[PDB]
Amino acid sequence: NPFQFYLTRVSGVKPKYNSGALHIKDILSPLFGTLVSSAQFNYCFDVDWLVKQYPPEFRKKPILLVHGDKREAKAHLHAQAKPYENISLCQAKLDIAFGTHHTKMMLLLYEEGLRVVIHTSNLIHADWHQKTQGIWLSPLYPRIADGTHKSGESPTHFKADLISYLMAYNAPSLKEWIDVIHKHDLSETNVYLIGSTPGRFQGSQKDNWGHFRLKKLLKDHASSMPNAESWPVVGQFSSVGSLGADESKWLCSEFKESMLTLGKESSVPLYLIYPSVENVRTSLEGYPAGGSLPYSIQTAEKQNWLHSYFHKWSAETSGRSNAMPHIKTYMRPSPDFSKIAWFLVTSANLSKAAWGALEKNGTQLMIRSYELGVLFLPSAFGLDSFKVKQKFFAGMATFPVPYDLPPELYGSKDRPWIWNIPYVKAPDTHGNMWVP
Numbered sequence: 001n002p003f004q005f006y007l008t009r010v011s012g013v014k015p016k017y018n019s020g021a022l023h024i025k026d027i028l029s030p031l032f033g034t035l036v037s038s039a040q041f042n043y044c045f046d047v048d049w050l051v052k053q054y055p056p057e058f059r060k061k062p063i064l065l066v067h068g069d070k071r072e073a074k075a076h077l078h079a080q081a082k083p084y085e086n087i088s089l090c091q092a093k094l095d096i097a098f099g100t101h102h103t104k105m106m107l108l109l110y111e112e113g114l115r116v117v118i119h120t121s122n123l124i125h126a127d128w129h130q131k132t133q134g135i136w137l138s139p140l141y142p143r144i145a146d147g148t149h150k151s152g153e154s155p156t157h158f159k160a161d162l163i164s165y166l167m168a169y170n171a172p173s174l175k176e177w178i179d180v181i182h183k184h185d186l187s188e189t190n191v192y193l194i195g196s197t198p199g200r201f202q203g204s205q206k207d208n209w210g211h212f213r214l215k216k217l218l219k220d221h222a223s224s225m226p227n228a229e230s231w232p233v234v235g236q237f238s239s240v241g242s243l244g245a246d247e248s249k250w251l252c253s254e255f256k257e258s259m260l261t262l263g264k265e266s267s268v269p270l271y272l273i274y275p276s277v278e279n280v281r282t283s284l285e286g287y288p289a290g291g292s293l294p295y296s297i298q299t300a301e302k303q304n305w306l307h308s309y310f311h312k313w314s315a316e317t318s319g320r321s322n323a324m325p326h327i328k329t330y331m332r333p334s335p336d337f338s339k340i341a342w343f344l345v346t347s348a349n350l351s352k353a354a355w356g357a358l359e360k361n362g363t364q365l366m367i368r369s370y371e372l373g374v375l376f377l378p379s380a381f382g383l384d385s386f387k388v389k390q391k392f393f394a395g396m397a398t399f400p401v402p403y404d405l406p407p408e409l410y411g412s413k414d415r416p417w418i419w420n421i422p423y424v425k426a427p428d429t430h431g432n433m434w435v436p
C-alpha cells in the first residue's frame with residue numbers, strides 16, 4: 001500500500017485485527033534499520049519503559065527526548081533519564097501561556113538511511129496497550145552521497161517543511177537533527193506536513209502553521225467538485241478545548257472555514273466524533289480510559305451547544321469499538337461516505353491552542369502548542385479522490401479509515417465523556433466506578 005498509515009496493536013482483539021498493526025517494538029526493531037541514533041518527540045514519557053522497547057543491541061545508542069516540561073515536571077523527567085547515560089533531553093520553549101508540547105514523532109537515524117515516524121501515542125505503556133492510535137511511517141530515506149548536490153525534496157515539500165518545523169524550536173540539540181535531514185533524500189514522500197508551533201504569526205508566516213496551513217494546502221493542492229457543500233467534514237479527537245459561547249466564535253467561523261476549503265475559487269454537515277460515557281464504561285480499559293480523554297466539566301458546561309455535534313466512537317471496521325481513541329483525525333468524505341477528498345492524522349485535538357485562533361483584527365494567528373500531523377491528498381497519489389476501504393484490515397488505492405462511517409449521533413441518554421466528574425450508576429468492564 002502507498003499510504004503507510006497504521007494503527008497500534010491492541011491487546012484483547014482477535015489476531016485478524018492486529019495483523020497489519022504495529023507495536024512500538026516493531027517500529028524500533030532491526031528489521032526497520034540498524035539504529036545509530038534516535039530522537040523521541042512527545043508529551044508524556046516513561047523512560048524505563050521506553051528503553052525496554054528498543055532492541056537490546058540498540059539500547060545504548062543515543063536518544064534525545066524532546067519535551068515541554070517545566071519546573072518540577074522537568075526535574076522529574078531529568079531524574080527518570082539520569083540512569084541512562086545515552087539519553088539527552090531538549091526542553092521545547094513554551095513562551096505562550098497554557099501551551100503544551102504535544103507533537104509525537106520519532107526521528108530514526110540508521111546505517112542504511114533515515115526514517116520519520118509521526119504518530120499519536122505517548123511513550124507510556126497504557127498508550128500502546130488498548131487504545132486506538134495512529135502511525136505514519138516514512139520510507140527509508142537514503143543518504144545523499146558526499147559531494148553530490150541535490151535537494152532531496154519531494155513534490156509535497158516535506159523535507160523543507162520538516163526542517164522549518166524543527167527550526168522553530170531554536171534548540172541546539174535539534175540543529176544536529178536538521179543537519180542530518182539535510183543530508184538525506186526525502187523525495188519519495190507523498191504526504192504533506194501540517195504542524196503547529198507556539199507564536200503569533202502574521203503576513204508571510206500566517207499560512208505556515210495550524211488551521212491556516214491546512215487551508216493553504218487545500219486551496220493549492222485539492223480541487224473543488226460540484227455539490228462540494230454536500231461533502232461533510234469529520235473531526236475525531238480525544239479532548240476539546242474552550243471553543244466559545246456559540247459555534248460562530250471559532251468552530252464554525254474560522255475552523256470550519258479552513259476545513260471546508262477546496263481549490264482556488266471563492267451549510268456543510270459537521271460530524272464530531274468523541275467518546276460517550278457509555279463508550280468509555282464498556283471499553284477494554286473501562287473508566288480509566290477516560291484518564292486520557294481530558295474534557296473538564298468546567299469547560300463543557302460553558303459550551304453545551306457543542307455536544308449536539310457529537311457522534312459515538314464506533315470502529316467495527318478495525319475491530320476497535322472498545323479500544324478508546326487517542327488518535328486524532330480529520331477528513332472530508334463524500335455525501336455517501338464512499339470517498340474522501342483528504343485525510344489528516346495528527347496530534348491536534350479540537351482546540352484553539354492546537355489549531356490557532358485569529359487575533360488583531362484577523363491579521364494574526366496565535367498558536368499556543370506544538371502539534372504535528374500528516375495530510376493525505378489524492379493529487380499527491382495521482383488521484384481525484386480516495387475510495388474508502390470497507391474493512392480496515394481487508395483488501396490498493398483505497399484509504400483505510402479506522403472507524404465506521406457514517407458516524408452515529410449520540411442517543412438522547414448519551415453524554416460526552418467528562419473526566420473530572422463521578423460515574424457511579426453502572427460499573428465498567430473491570431467492576432469499578434469512576435470517582436475523581
Ligand SMILES: CC(C)c1cccc2c(O)c(C(=O)O)cnc12
Nearest residue numbers: 043102121122291292293294347
Ligand atoms: C490535559 C492534560 C493534563 C492531559 C491529560 C490526559 C491525557 C493527555 C494527553 O494524552 C495528551 C496528549 O497526548 O497530547 C495531552 N494532555 C493530556
